Design a protein around this ligand. Structure first.
Ligand code: SF4
Length: 86
């Protein structure tokens, strides 16, 4: 439940550029509708680019390639998601 001290801020420069919503339920994913899988089934957990092996990862909060020294919620989402197809 509780967010980690280093939660990626939704309003971080990176989160802005990426449109990282932190919550997939509220996420613009619905509109952004990335290819691969329907928006409802998209979140960081399924993201090709996610560093699961983040230095400090935990189940709810994994690392994103572009967001070092913070963690993104696995049930969050951003624009450059891409369904894990590799
Ligand atoms: S690139 Fe992937 S892991 Fe990183 S914030 Fe976007 S959806 Fe999440």
């Amino acid at each position: 439940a509780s967010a980690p001290a280093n939660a990626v801020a939704a309003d971080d420069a990176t989160a802005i550029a990426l449109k990282y919503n932190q919550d997939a339920t509220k996420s613009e994913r619905v509109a952004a509708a990335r290819p691969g899988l329907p928006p409802e089934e998209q979140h960081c957990a399924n993201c090709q680019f996610m560093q699961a092996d983040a230095a400090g990862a935990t189940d709810e909060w994994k690392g994103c390639q572009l967001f070092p020294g913070k963690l993104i919620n696995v049930n969050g989402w951003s624009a450059s998601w891409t369904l894990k197809a590799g």
